[PDB]
PDB file of C-alpha atoms in Angstrom:
ATOM      1  CA  UNK C 210    -119.552 -54.085  45.800  1.00 25.24           C
ATOM      2  CA  UNK C 211    -121.040 -51.485  43.495  1.00 24.43           C
ATOM      3  CA  UNK C 212    -124.601 -52.624  43.465  1.00 20.80           C
ATOM      4  CA  UNK C 213    -124.038 -52.400  47.223  1.00 21.56           C
ATOM      5  CA  UNK C 214    -122.807 -48.808  46.897  1.00 20.32           C
ATOM      6  CA  UNK C 215    -125.711 -47.849  44.626  1.00 21.81           C
ATOM      7  CA  UNK C 216    -128.399 -49.155  46.940  1.00 18.84           C
ATOM      8  CA  UNK C 217    -126.642 -47.754  49.999  1.00 17.35           C
ATOM      9  CA  UNK C 218    -126.935 -44.319  48.401  1.00 13.02           C
ATOM     10  CA  UNK C 219    -130.591 -44.963  47.568  1.00 16.75           C
ATOM     11  CA  UNK C 220    -131.347 -45.977  51.159  1.00 10.41           C
ATOM     12  CA  UNK C 221    -129.509 -42.899  52.430  1.00  9.33           C
ATOM     13  CA  UNK C 222    -131.696 -40.704  50.230  1.00  8.86           C
ATOM     14  CA  UNK C 223    -134.900 -42.385  51.415  1.00  8.84           C
ATOM     15  CA  UNK C 224    -133.857 -42.059  55.064  1.00  7.54           C
ATOM     16  CA  UNK C 225    -133.023 -38.389  54.565  1.00  5.38           C
ATOM     17  CA  UNK C 226    -136.418 -37.839  52.933  1.00  4.78           C
ATOM     18  CA  UNK C 227    -138.296 -39.419  55.831  1.00  7.69           C
ATOM     19  CA  UNK C 228    -136.170 -37.530  58.370  1.00  5.72           C
ATOM     20  CA  UNK C 229    -136.777 -34.161  56.711  1.00  6.23           C
ATOM     21  CA  UNK C 230    -140.498 -34.910  56.469  1.00  5.96           C
ATOM     22  CA  UNK C 231    -140.632 -35.729  60.179  1.00  8.39           C
ATOM     23  CA  UNK C 232    -138.606 -32.682  61.207  1.00  9.22           C
ATOM     24  CA  UNK C 233    -140.786 -30.476  58.985  1.00  8.31           C
ATOM     25  CA  UNK C 234    -143.973 -31.880  60.510  1.00 10.03           C
ATOM     26  CA  UNK C 235    -142.798 -31.467  64.102  1.00 13.65           C
ATOM     27  CA  UNK C 236    -141.446 -27.960  63.437  1.00 17.59           C
ATOM     28  CA  UNK C 237    -144.740 -26.913  61.838  1.00 13.72           C
ATOM     29  CA  UNK C 238    -146.627 -28.363  64.809  1.00 12.72           C
ATOM     30  CA  UNK C 239    -144.324 -26.548  67.239  1.00 14.02           C
ATOM     31  CA  UNK C 240    -144.747 -23.222  65.447  1.00 11.93           C
ATOM     32  CA  UNK C 241    -148.531 -23.622  65.274  1.00  9.98           C
ATOM     33  CA  UNK C 242    -148.607 -24.400  69.001  1.00 13.57           C
ATOM     34  CA  UNK C 243    -146.483 -21.320  69.704  1.00 13.15           C
ATOM     35  CA  UNK C 244    -148.796 -19.168  67.578  1.00 17.06           C
ATOM     36  CA  UNK C 245    -151.925 -20.474  69.295  1.00 17.48           C
ATOM     37  CA  UNK C 246    -150.284 -20.017  72.712  1.00 14.69           C
ATOM     38  CA  UNK C 247    -149.396 -16.381  72.055  1.00 12.12           C
ATOM     39  CA  UNK C 248    -152.821 -15.791  70.478  1.00  8.40           C
ATOM     40  CA  UNK C 249    -154.599 -17.189  73.542  1.00 10.32           C
ATOM     41  CA  UNK C 250    -152.334 -15.178  75.859  1.00  9.95           C
ATOM     42  CA  UNK C 251    -153.229 -12.013  73.941  1.00  9.12           C
ATOM     43  CA  UNK C 252    -156.906 -12.983  74.103  1.00  8.62           C
ATOM     44  CA  UNK C 253    -156.639 -13.452  77.874  1.00  8.91           C
ATOM     45  CA  UNK C 254    -155.073  -9.991  78.111  1.00  5.44           C
ATOM     46  CA  UNK C 255    -157.836  -8.536  75.944  1.00 10.08           C
ATOM     47  CA  UNK C 256    -160.630 -10.051  78.013  1.00 11.68           C
ATOM     48  CA  UNK C 257    -158.838  -8.672  81.072  1.00 12.82           C
ATOM     49  CA  UNK C 258    -158.991  -5.235  79.431  1.00 12.41           C
ATOM     50  CA  UNK C 259    -162.709  -5.733  78.785  1.00 12.11           C
ATOM     51  CA  UNK C 260    -163.536  -6.345  75.117  1.00 10.39           C
ATOM     52  CA  UNK C 261    -165.480  -9.647  74.693  1.00 10.10           C
ATOM     53  CA  UNK C 262    -163.766 -10.937  71.538  1.00 13.80           C
ATOM     54  CA  UNK C 263    -164.811  -7.776  69.663  1.00 14.75           C
ATOM     55  CA  UNK C 264    -168.221  -8.872  68.268  1.00  8.10           C
ATOM     56  CA  UNK C 265    -167.548 -11.950  66.118  1.00 10.37           C
ATOM     57  CA  UNK C 266    -164.557 -13.908  64.852  1.00 12.48           C
ATOM     58  CA  UNK C 267    -165.944 -16.584  62.530  1.00 12.86           C
ATOM     59  CA  UNK C 268    -168.408 -14.670  60.298  1.00 11.28           C
ATOM     60  CA  UNK C 269    -166.383 -11.472  59.848  1.00  9.92           C
ATOM     61  CA  UNK C 270    -164.495  -8.775  61.778  1.00  9.02           C
ATOM     62  CA  UNK C 271    -166.368  -5.936  63.502  1.00  7.70           C
ATOM     63  CA  UNK C 272    -165.885  -3.132  66.021  1.00 12.08           C
ATOM     64  CA  UNK C 273    -164.898  -3.602  69.669  1.00 10.50           C
ATOM     65  CA  UNK C 274    -164.719  -1.511  72.835  1.00  9.95           C
ATOM     66  CA  UNK C 275    -161.611   0.284  71.541  1.00  8.31           C
ATOM     67  CA  UNK C 276    -159.978   0.104  68.127  1.00  9.08           C
ATOM     68  CA  UNK C 277    -156.234   0.418  68.752  1.00  9.73           C
ATOM     69  CA  UNK C 278    -153.632   1.671  71.231  1.00 12.91           C
ATOM     70  CA  UNK C 279    -155.802   0.722  74.207  1.00 10.67           C
ATOM     71  CA  UNK C 280    -152.858  -0.290  76.403  1.00  9.63           C
ATOM     72  CA  UNK C 281    -149.160  -1.091  76.187  1.00  9.92           C
ATOM     73  CA  UNK C 282    -149.809  -4.776  76.915  1.00  9.77           C
ATOM     74  CA  UNK C 283    -152.123  -5.128  73.913  1.00  9.26           C
ATOM     75  CA  UNK C 284    -149.715  -3.320  71.571  1.00  7.24           C
ATOM     76  CA  UNK C 285    -146.600  -5.157  72.794  1.00  8.01           C
ATOM     77  CA  UNK C 286    -147.360  -8.254  70.676  1.00 11.19           C
ATOM     78  CA  UNK C 287    -150.836  -7.927  69.094  1.00 10.90           C
ATOM     79  CA  UNK C 288    -150.677 -11.690  68.406  1.00 15.88           C
ATOM     80  CA  UNK C 289    -147.930 -11.194  65.834  1.00 13.76           C
ATOM     81  CA  UNK C 290    -148.588  -7.707  64.456  1.00 16.08           C
ATOM     82  CA  UNK C 291    -152.395  -7.850  64.198  1.00 16.91           C
ATOM     83  CA  UNK C 292    -152.382 -11.631  63.669  1.00 17.79           C
ATOM     84  CA  UNK C 293    -150.068 -11.236  60.661  1.00 23.23           C
ATOM     85  CA  UNK C 294    -149.371 -14.952  60.261  1.00 26.62           C
ATOM     86  CA  UNK C 295    -147.474 -14.187  57.082  1.00 26.80           C
ATOM     87  CA  UNK C 296    -146.408 -17.249  55.052  1.00 28.56           C
ATOM     88  CA  UNK C 297    -142.846 -15.921  54.848  1.00 28.43           C
ATOM     89  CA  UNK C 298    -142.516 -16.040  58.637  1.00 26.58           C
ATOM     90  CA  UNK C 299    -143.623 -19.685  58.678  1.00 25.81           C
ATOM     91  CA  UNK C 300    -141.193 -20.552  55.875  1.00 24.94           C
ATOM     92  CA  UNK C 301    -138.366 -18.868  57.782  1.00 26.93           C
ATOM     93  CA  UNK C 302    -139.340 -20.693  60.973  1.00 25.51           C
ATOM     94  CA  UNK C 303    -139.389 -24.128  59.336  1.00 27.84           C
ATOM     95  CA  UNK C 304    -136.235 -23.551  57.236  1.00 25.54           C
ATOM     96  CA  UNK C 305    -134.177 -22.176  60.138  1.00 26.92           C
ATOM     97  CA  UNK C 306    -133.207 -25.696  61.280  1.00 29.50           C
ATOM     98  CA  UNK C 307    -133.478 -27.337  57.829  1.00 30.45           C
ATOM     99  CA  UNK C 308    -130.558 -25.825  55.883  1.00 31.25           C
ATOM    100  CA  UNK C 309    -128.256 -26.796  58.758  1.00 32.39           C
ATOM    101  CA  UNK C 310    -126.989 -29.921  56.985  1.00 35.50           C
ATOM    102  CA  UNK C 311    -127.955 -32.951  54.946  1.00 36.09           C
ATOM    103  CA  UNK C 312    -130.254 -31.380  52.348  1.00 34.41           C
ATOM    104  CA  UNK C 313    -129.934 -31.020  48.581  1.00 33.40           C
ATOM    105  CA  UNK C 314    -131.932 -29.864  45.559  1.00 34.32           C
ATOM    106  CA  UNK C 315    -134.322 -32.818  46.028  1.00 33.90           C
ATOM    107  CA  UNK C 316    -134.986 -31.711  49.617  1.00 30.24           C
ATOM    108  CA  UNK C 317    -136.617 -28.401  50.484  1.00 31.05           C
ATOM    109  CA  UNK C 318    -137.410 -27.827  46.797  1.00 28.67           C
ATOM    110  CA  UNK C 319    -140.002 -30.602  46.627  1.00 30.67           C
ATOM    111  CA  UNK C 320    -141.031 -29.730  50.188  1.00 25.45           C
ATOM    112  CA  UNK C 321    -142.193 -26.346  48.871  1.00 25.16           C
ATOM    113  CA  UNK C 322    -145.360 -28.110  47.707  1.00 22.81           C
ATOM    114  CA  UNK C 323    -146.017 -29.294  51.270  1.00 24.72           C
ATOM    115  CA  UNK C 324    -145.337 -25.804  52.635  1.00 22.87           C
ATOM    116  CA  UNK C 325    -147.827 -24.390  50.126  1.00 22.90           C
ATOM    117  CA  UNK C 326    -150.444 -27.002  51.014  1.00 24.39           C
ATOM    118  CA  UNK C 327    -150.133 -26.489  54.773  1.00 21.96           C
ATOM    119  CA  UNK C 328    -150.415 -22.743  54.169  1.00 19.83           C
ATOM    120  CA  UNK C 329    -153.559 -23.329  52.100  1.00 16.75           C
ATOM    121  CA  UNK C 330    -154.933 -25.332  55.039  1.00 17.88           C
ATOM    122  CA  UNK C 331    -155.372 -22.118  57.032  1.00 17.29           C
TER     123      UNK C 331
ATOM    124  CA  UNK A 314    -123.085 -27.389  33.329  1.00 21.02           C
ATOM    125  CA  UNK A 315    -124.911 -29.688  35.785  1.00 18.73           C
ATOM    126  CA  UNK A 316    -123.415 -27.697  38.699  1.00 18.49           C
ATOM    127  CA  UNK A 317    -124.146 -24.013  39.216  1.00 17.89           C
ATOM    128  CA  UNK A 318    -127.036 -24.264  36.742  1.00 19.12           C
ATOM    129  CA  UNK A 319    -129.063 -26.451  39.105  1.00 19.48           C
ATOM    130  CA  UNK A 320    -127.467 -24.760  42.141  1.00 17.29           C
ATOM    131  CA  UNK A 321    -129.271 -21.575  41.091  1.00 16.61           C
ATOM    132  CA  UNK A 322    -132.367 -23.274  42.499  1.00 19.07           C
ATOM    133  CA  UNK A 323    -130.559 -23.547  45.842  1.00 21.38           C
ATOM    134  CA  UNK A 324    -129.588 -19.865  45.745  1.00 22.19           C
ATOM    135  CA  UNK A 325    -133.172 -18.905  44.848  1.00 24.58           C
ATOM    136  CA  UNK A 326    -134.445 -20.986  47.774  1.00 21.78           C
ATOM    137  CA  UNK A 327    -131.951 -19.322  50.123  1.00 18.97           C
ATOM    138  CA  UNK A 328    -133.107 -15.892  48.956  1.00 17.56           C
ATOM    139  CA  UNK A 329    -136.729 -16.946  49.486  1.00 20.34           C
ATOM    140  CA  UNK A 330    -135.817 -18.006  53.035  1.00 22.31           C
ATOM    141  CA  UNK A 331    -134.976 -14.404  53.951  1.00 20.53           C
TER     142      UNK A 331
ATOM    143  CA  UNK K 262    -188.945 -22.897  55.884  1.00 17.06           C
ATOM    144  CA  UNK K 263    -189.100 -19.364  54.456  1.00 15.50           C
ATOM    145  CA  UNK K 264    -190.887 -20.147  51.141  1.00 14.09           C
ATOM    146  CA  UNK K 265    -188.606 -22.483  49.166  1.00 10.14           C
ATOM    147  CA  UNK K 266    -185.153 -23.991  49.580  1.00 10.78           C
ATOM    148  CA  UNK K 267    -184.636 -26.183  46.517  1.00 11.66           C
ATOM    149  CA  UNK K 268    -185.635 -23.932  43.566  1.00 10.93           C
ATOM    150  CA  UNK K 269    -184.250 -20.612  44.813  1.00  8.33           C
ATOM    151  CA  UNK K 270    -184.198 -18.272  47.819  1.00  9.04           C
ATOM    152  CA  UNK K 271    -187.094 -16.100  48.962  1.00  8.95           C
ATOM    153  CA  UNK K 272    -188.291 -13.903  51.805  1.00  9.85           C
ATOM    154  CA  UNK K 273    -189.863 -15.092  55.063  1.00 10.38           C
ATOM    155  CA  UNK K 274    -191.911 -13.626  57.917  1.00 10.31           C
ATOM    156  CA  UNK K 275    -188.763 -12.135  59.494  1.00  5.47           C
ATOM    157  CA  UNK K 276    -185.397 -11.497  57.863  1.00  3.25           C
ATOM    158  CA  UNK K 277    -182.720 -11.566  60.571  1.00  2.00           C
ATOM    159  CA  UNK K 278    -182.295 -11.541  64.352  1.00  2.00           C
ATOM    160  CA  UNK K 279    -185.455 -13.614  64.778  1.00  2.00           C
ATOM    161  CA  UNK K 280    -184.342 -14.936  68.175  1.00  2.00           C
ATOM    162  CA  UNK K 281    -181.246 -15.487  70.287  1.00  2.00           C
ATOM    163  CA  UNK K 282    -181.399 -19.254  69.724  1.00  2.00           C
ATOM    164  CA  UNK K 283    -181.176 -18.808  65.952  1.00  2.00           C
ATOM    165  CA  UNK K 284    -178.627 -15.992  66.231  1.00  2.00           C
ATOM    166  CA  UNK K 285    -176.391 -18.330  68.257  1.00  2.00           C
ATOM    167  CA  UNK K 286    -175.553 -20.630  65.313  1.00  2.00           C
ATOM    168  CA  UNK K 287    -177.614 -19.883  62.170  1.00  2.00           C
ATOM    169  CA  UNK K 288    -176.649 -23.385  60.988  1.00  2.00           C
ATOM    170  CA  UNK K 289    -172.989 -22.434  60.729  1.00  2.00           C
ATOM    171  CA  UNK K 290    -173.307 -18.707  60.037  1.00  2.00           C
ATOM    172  CA  UNK K 291    -176.132 -18.779  57.468  1.00  2.00           C
ATOM    173  CA  UNK K 292    -175.089 -22.230  56.210  1.00  2.00           C
ATOM    174  CA  UNK K 293    -171.589 -20.958  55.388  1.00  2.00           C
ATOM    175  CA  UNK K 294    -170.190 -24.282  54.180  1.00  2.00           C
ATOM    176  CA  UNK K 295    -166.879 -22.638  53.377  1.00  3.10           C
ATOM    177  CA  UNK K 296    -164.313 -24.991  51.794  1.00  3.56           C
ATOM    178  CA  UNK K 297    -161.600 -23.914  54.240  1.00  2.00           C
ATOM    179  CA  UNK K 298    -163.662 -25.091  57.283  1.00  2.00           C
ATOM    180  CA  UNK K 299    -164.178 -28.509  55.689  1.00  2.00           C
ATOM    181  CA  UNK K 300    -160.509 -28.821  54.714  1.00  2.00           C
ATOM    182  CA  UNK K 301    -159.440 -28.018  58.271  1.00  2.00           C
ATOM    183  CA  UNK K 302    -161.969 -30.472  59.706  1.00  2.00           C
ATOM    184  CA  UNK K 303    -160.870 -33.343  57.462  1.00  2.00           C
ATOM    185  CA  UNK K 304    -157.156 -32.551  57.853  1.00  2.00           C
ATOM    186  CA  UNK K 305    -157.169 -32.221  61.654  1.00  2.00           C
ATOM    187  CA  UNK K 306    -156.915 -36.026  61.972  1.00  2.00           C
ATOM    188  CA  UNK K 307    -154.745 -36.496  58.848  1.00  2.00           C
ATOM    189  CA  UNK K 308    -151.495 -34.554  59.364  1.00  2.00           C
ATOM    190  CA  UNK K 309    -151.060 -36.142  62.799  1.00  2.00           C
ATOM    191  CA  UNK K 310    -148.714 -38.805  61.406  1.00  2.00           C
ATOM    192  CA  UNK K 311    -147.871 -40.958  58.416  1.00  2.00           C
ATOM    193  CA  UNK K 312    -148.306 -38.458  55.577  1.00  2.00           C
ATOM    194  CA  UNK K 313    -145.986 -37.208  52.842  1.00  2.00           C
TER     195      UNK K 313
END
């Protein structure tokens, strides 16, 4: 009966690890999709205003038709405060449904490496 | 000793959340 | 080919804005093989599933 108890605990830990990994991955995907959706909505609004993507987005950042405060619609969101995809916001978004239950010191703590890596991706 | 000492990691993580 | 590509860099007949066709790409913005663009490209098909 104890070896049974021991390995039941081990299997519980492994299942919790896989579940937290899956929930983390889907939450990160959901947040990235939300960010790209709001970014593309803001870009649609901007092209409606008239600026054609400023001048360039990949090489560097340059001037546009107007710098700031062009219209209330542009300033309402600004794609997250001038595209301020701060890491802290992403950590808060992914941890908001993670500390609900069923996590311990071997949970989010080791997941911090994966958070850091996915942040280093972009 | 093996309680709050390691739980300080959990409190630090909670502070880092907000 | 400007003057040389292997030993070092050198001047050419024209410096920049030679034509619209070149200005369109410039071989990835002047051959900007940034590590971040390669990491994103390789990872785009990796984090889809089955990773830890």
